[PDB]
Amino acid sequence: SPPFRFGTVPNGSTERNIRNNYPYMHQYMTKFNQKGVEDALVSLKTGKLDAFIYDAAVLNYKAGRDEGCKLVTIGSGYIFATTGYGIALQKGSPWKRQIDLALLQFVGDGEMEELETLWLTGICHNEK
């Protein structure tokens, strides 16, 4: 009954994943994509429809570092498909194995946790 939202900005992972997996709700909200993410947050606050299917990491950071942590996310981070991020390289570049070795080594040496705690750590993450 009520007009809900499926706001997904073009040229992104969310729209492509939705249309690859469940190409049914995209047509319903084809003419609903917001211009960017700041105007998307503005439209989320300015009540016309309270729904955004976005990246788990970006949404979690925004919720953690929000003004009073008002808007939230449905579920305990139940990602539709946890695929993560990747690092680009040229086709057949001579550095891929070394890149992977360095990445796994830095995964081992407890430092990306420091990076996350320095940059993406929220204020209400501990708060309930």
Place this chain on the structure above:
Amino acid sequence: ASQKCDLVTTGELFFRSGFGIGMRKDSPWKQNVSLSILKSHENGFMEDLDKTWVRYQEC
């Protein structure tokens, strides 16, 4: 701790290592097993096994 709920689950999670399946440097099934397990994960076949084998009891 779910079946014989006598202990607790203190502590947090760290050093999160996704369980893999390693092979020798030569094997004609590495790509095939990789794509098969990716397809199973995408269609959620493993979730049904989790429901029917492990996550089935509480106290």
